[PDB]
Subunit: 141 residues, 12 copies
């Protein structure tokens, strides 16, 4: 029972870098927390990260083809990519948009998401735990 | 830990009314779902609903005086009330903003919240499960 | 067949106060006129005024729960209250928004209404006669 | 005791065309309904329609010179024509602006009217009955 | 030198109607004043007025073909007509845009002209004398 | 298949005037080109041009009643006329909006069209060949 | 003689809460200070506070009936309440708007007041002292 | 009749500099042209120029105390100076605003003037002849 | 000559088999064949390429600039977002035709601004897959 | 303590000019009212006025070097001068911004001030007494 | 021939270094004059450094640079965001015009992010402190 | 001290292409100038260009890990990429944004940069010398 967790640009540097903004949990550690949560919930999680929009697009395409759910933290592309929104709008299974930081407590431009209108829902500002909460929503359909 | 769940105007009519927009769970069923989850999590939850902004402020003021966290669905007041923002800004414990519907998939005016900048985080679009995921975040502190 | 006529804040002071803006008809006179008109049309009118948004909401919920039509002059809340729009949006019977003054010949902020998009129709600037015309529309459906 | 009902562009196609938006009553049927109501009220109704802004302006100039009340559904020109607004501004008798459809539940651009600020009042969204309610107002004023 | 003076919608009613706004001089009186001033300057003035945009465009098309200058008071069309701008932009002889009233001392929407950017110049607010002053400019070159 | 090609204000002057902006083809030459291409395609084209909005609306009403497609270059009316949009919105056959010039390489105001949202599609900047391409689209339905 | 000082929502928590933003003076201490100052000026101060818009409207109605001056710190309602502005607009005696904090040094949204254009004057950012200065104004008229 | 012609910053360098924007006529030449024109009209013209806003305000103050008309080319201050507008608003004799260039055919910012709303009228884009047309207007009143 | 490059941007490799209600039922392969058939009618050669990679798109645009060949471009979502793509297209000396399969003016407001239109020779919107074939015929004649 | 009261352009004309807008007190009389009120408070007031922005800046620099507070009515520069704002931001002692008129009951452009965000506070609409109230604030520090 | 370059500083810059030294540095206007004169000597230029709080004085300096056909390095301080008159005087310059801001005007209030001068300037240097003037001088010395 | 000079999309085509916009110096020639100049300064420059946003992010991540300064000409990404801004914001060493062209003398959209607010400084419009000037800044910190 497969859920894709997909992280966009720069997020490979979590924890190690920008800890005051995005937390101390590294990308490897987050993969381990997601896999733990997934197991408890009876799901298989697949965690991917890329700085390449083309790569991200390809993973979304695969998830639309497999009709699998997607938890997506698109990084800066959240606020800028129509191409990413159009790939995501193809998904039939739920799409949960996640932001680690509270985008509403930062610069104004971070308060607009291209993904939110086509997502099932959005979790913002709850740190790493956002991913884990999103998983639990998907376990409940 | 004591967690205050507070619902704003009209939300007493959940499930019985507007089920296409806000779900089929009644307010009474919500309260019991929340108590069930709080028990599992080892928290105590107190859920309250009012159509009166003054009553909402009073509950916020009490959570402020007790340093207790708040999970708040302010209903229409999310987009309109600076008084409620200012009450909420005094809270020292976490404040989680919850919207049952995906306010990003509705009218443009719903895409702006006065609470998000001062909230710890926001959960939108995940139905009644939003309140349960918020509790789970507060349990992990 | 019952029609609810609901007046929002300050409108208890009609006639006696601000006559150059909202006319020289008092709220007591307006109730008697409306009852008179309702009698001739074979309707029953229940006319209620409050300065409290919560009380205005409760009256709207009652019309919703009764599937009775509403003629609403929300006063200042017309331009500010999403909570009120949301309660009115749940009405299954007609809603006619009424403004005594011509809100388009005043400050630009009075030219936007949260109610209009969700109302059946709107009558503006015809004085107290707007309520009587709204009745007659309801009498024919 | 003579009232001019002026319909702007495309409105000769009412009923037989675009029923879902502007209703199933044809322009002929509308003229007949207006004349019947005028008879009931003790008024004479002169109902004219034109696709030409120049012809509409001439009819407005004529009502200005005759000191006759006007009920105007200007159609598209409502949102676009300063010239029509300036012609209306010299009317000494009342001007009632009428829209069949609820212009506030349609494209954002329909929510601005060059006419409303200079009108005695405005009726929107009440269908064809809006002309009949405008007539009744004029009969009582 | 043949100079065309062209007046747009409603200006056939100058002097008689709206004199607090556009002065007390009538359109027949204006023609006379312009003709007299033209004789003094050694020009011939042709003065026309129409409420019909198509008619105004035909007059502009004729001045374009004859390479004759235009003094234009487009009335409300100043703020609204791209088609009139496009016809005026063809003129090879000078175009002088004239407003009797001071459009900057009125509604905000009067402060934008589609004609000013393509005109040789603009005269506003100087009453009927604007036309006479434009004529003298055109005599000088 | 009958196809109506409708040109709006000023476009009677194609080619002999403003050749740098709208090309060297005259209106008479355009009709001939269009007729010869419709002949090759197995279609009959009726080409009409008018500076009068009322006249344009009449031809659009006719195409609606006849269920015939329209290729429309509305000229300046593109950017200004809601009445023209509303008449076009009733067409049941395809509507193709054509602009000879590239309206996106010119003033900011030419970048918005009231017609594009209700057209089947739009061709901009391809010169007179744009009418002939529109014709080929209609030949393939 | 009587001056009405009215404090809006959350201001009962002055002093003991948010001392960095609104000062260390409690609402009880403020009442005492105003009452003493007023008495030294030969005035009698009545100091009110409520979290309920409706109660605030009721106090302003009574000050309008009594033709007494009002010093009003509306809190969050300053930026949001048209109903309050409308009640305040009928006051015949002076209306002084007071803000303890400098609203122009905080979020952009606090730089707009619905009250300031209908107030006699406004004092901002002078702390608790603003209410005492407002009293001294009223003592001079 | 004494008329003051006042030129603002940089205009001492007219004619010699920026001749492609503001013409070839020098400030010395412009003074002699204005003096010759004024003799012809039976007026006295006093022509002054300064780069100093304080000095232009002092001249406007003198024309206010003396109730003398002003022809003002404020140059860049037209778009920026509220202090200059406020001095000019005090003038009881006419105020004619002049721009040598067509400010509507240049950058967007030159299309708003602080002076135009408090001016008697405005003349734009007719080069130096603007000052002469304004003199002639004042000779007539 | 008359070699023309048809370039499709992101997600457009999934034409026809996916989102048929918004972009039509013609597949990318089918579209390549239709354009080739049309190209043979017109006496020109069409090269059709597609990529989800902005850098790849830019490379194809550079190659067209260097070869002074015209381009028919459907940039997909990048139409609305990429200044880099606009700047590469602005170097083109031969014509550039912007094509959208859907009618972008009947959709979300953000789709009604293109960064490419001001620098394109022209734009065809809303005419389905036939927009590419119409752009080819324009190019065959100028 | 030395307090500096600084008046900006045109305020040397107070009283004698524009009486209905800025009151009937002359600048000479304002200076004596201030000096007297300062004595009473045991302060020394220095009151100065200039139409020259460079002069106001010099006075502000001098207060910065002396660590003296300033009461500033900048007149038109309030809404326009970033240089004045930056000079004022250098002040370590309090800065009180004063407007005689209620700038929020006038043109929209006067509702924005460059000074308010850097001033300690602001007093608007209380006439000449606003300076006296500012002085009293400064007496209490 | 020793090329003359005019360095013109607008309002409040005579108080450089009074505050906010993290935004504007701790170097004073007179110390700046000396650093610029020295760098200019090294480059073979002659720097004329002038400062005024009077817009009319700044226009008069710009008028002289226009008549002399001399390059200008301009830090107009607050008038950058407000003065059309200053822009229109600068538009008349035939030699290069380099706009300099000591602070990073894009890291501060939004109203600082618009300059009336940048469109008419040869180019603009921002956020590089006082070194911005010296870099402007070096650009002028090369081209 | 190693300095990274990173050029974004299409800049590999400098000099040979678009010379009227970005100069006659090729990218190879620019690499030449920079390496030399850096050596003169006692620095070592590593100059890289790519059309791939993911490749540019990788080079930024490397400079962030190495604590090395960055001279960045992002090309069109300057106006569009929040992902690039976020990668840059992590740099601890100085970041200098360079534009060869004067972006303020072009289209309005080029006047906004996502990089400038997080950069140390920005050099624009100085052609290729802007890179050399930036190196000289970094030689000094
Ligand atoms: O660049 C980023 C992530 C950017 C980013 C993330 C968010 O989605 C979020 O809160 O998760 C909000 C959104 O506005 C945003 O752009 N991270 C990074 C950069 C360098 C080093 C370490 C981490
Ligand atoms: O009025 C409301 C809720 C209003 C509301 C809720 C949200 O916070 C949310 O999605 O939870 C979104 C927000 O924009 C909003 O205004 N509910 C109701 C009304 C009538 C009958 C039954 C229920
Ligand atoms: O405050 C009000 C009504 C306010 C009000 C009414 C309108 O709906 C309308 O035209 O009916 C327009 C709307 O913009 C508005 O806010 N009335 C009042 C106040 C004091 C004393 C006496 C009467
Ligand atoms: O074109 C129109 C009416 C247009 C119209 C009318 C309104 O005033 C109204 O609600 O009555 C709202 C206003 O926004 C508008 O433009 N009707 C039509 C068109 C084709 C066929 C049949 C009928
Ligand atoms: O309708 C009009 C003139 C309209 C008009 C004129 C102006 O060009 C000008 O000031 O000359 C300003 C412009 O904003 C405007 O719209 N006049 C009219 C109407 C009824 C009766 C008598 C006269
Ligand atoms: O006035 C016009 C056409 C104007 C026009 C046409 C467009 O639809 C187009 O590109 O076809 C774009 C649109 O913005 C516009 O308004 N032509 C003309 C005027 C005078 C003399 C000769 C010809
Ligand atoms: O909520 C408020 C006051 C709010 C408020 C006050 C102001 O009028 C002012 O400066 O006096 C400015 C205005 O923008 C604002 O909204 N106070 C509070 C909240 C929680 C705990 C303790 C005190
Ligand atoms: O600086 C200016 C004139 C400024 C100016 C003039 C206008 O009022 C007008 O057209 O008369 C339009 C207005 O927008 C503007 O700012 N002139 C100058 C500058 C340098 C050398 C020689 C002459
Ligand atoms: O993502 C896209 C194309 C996106 C796109 C194309 C358009 O240029 C156009 O109408 O051709 C309009 C434009 O606004 C847009 O972004 N297609 C896709 C996505 C998933 C599966 C199958 C196809
Ligand atoms: O020009 C002015 C003052 C202008 C002015 C004053 C205010 O600071 C204030 O209310 O005190 C509000 C602010 O908006 C403004 O511009 N006065 C004047 C002019 C001519 C003759 C006599 C007096
Ligand atoms: O007034 C100023 C500098 C003004 C200023 C400087 C900038 O040009 C720059 O970064 O160089 C950016 C620009 O936004 C700005 O206004 N300084 C000051 C004021 C008072 C006391 C001491 C120093
Ligand atoms: O595409 C670009 C650079 C684009 C670009 C550069 C700038 O940063 C700058 O001024 O250096 C300004 C910025 O607005 C921008 O987008 N160059 C190119 C394109 C094709 C062929 C040859 C060269």
């Amino acid at each position: 029972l497969i859920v894709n967790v997909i992280n966009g640009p720069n997020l490979g540097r979590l924890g190690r870098r920008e800890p005051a903004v995005y937390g101390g949990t590294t990308h490897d550690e987050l993969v381990a927390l997601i896999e733990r949560e997934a197991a408890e919930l009876g799901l298989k999680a697949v965690v991917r990260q890329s700085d390449s929009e083309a790569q991200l697009l390809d993973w979304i395409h695969q998830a639309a083809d497999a009709a699998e759910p997607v938890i997506l933290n698109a990084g800066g592309l959240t606020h800028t990519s129509v191409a990413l929104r159009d790939a995501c709008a193809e998904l039939s299974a739920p799409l949960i948009e996640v932001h680690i930081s509270n985008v509403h407590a930062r610069e104004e431009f971070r308060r607009h998401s291209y993904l939110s209108p086509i997502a099932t829902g959005v979790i913002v500002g709850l740190g790493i735990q956002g991913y884990l909460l999103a998983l639990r929503y998907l376990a409940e359909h």
